[PDB]
Amino acid sequence: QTVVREMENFMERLRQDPQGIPALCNGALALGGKQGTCTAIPCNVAQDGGLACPTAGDVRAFQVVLRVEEKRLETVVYRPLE
């Protein structure tokens, strides 16, 4: 499936650009010829690595949900310590 492959490529593109995610993953877009959407939820990361999405405080990672028709792909992109 072309759509699944494109969703993975785009997701990898986001994973390389965590500081760009608020702009690059911000509503509707086309992938593999179909309309879909990207949503990025800011998450906290505990000292033990536990994830809180959405965050009540610091944004240390994003929960990214890419949706194209019924297909869906969710991952976590961690932000650099800086």
Distances (CA, A) of 31 to 40, 56, 61: 17, 32, 24
Q: Where are the alpha helices (DSSP H) in 1-82?
A: 2-15, 21-24
Query: Determination technique for this PDB entry?
Result: X-ray
Amino acid in the structure at residue 9: N
* Token pair listed for 6: 């494109």
As a whole number of angstroms, the distance between CA 46 and CA 9 comes to: 29
Instruction: With beta carbons less than 8 A apart as the criterion, state whether 79 and 62 touch.
Output: yes
Q: What is the resolution of this structure in A?
A: 2.3
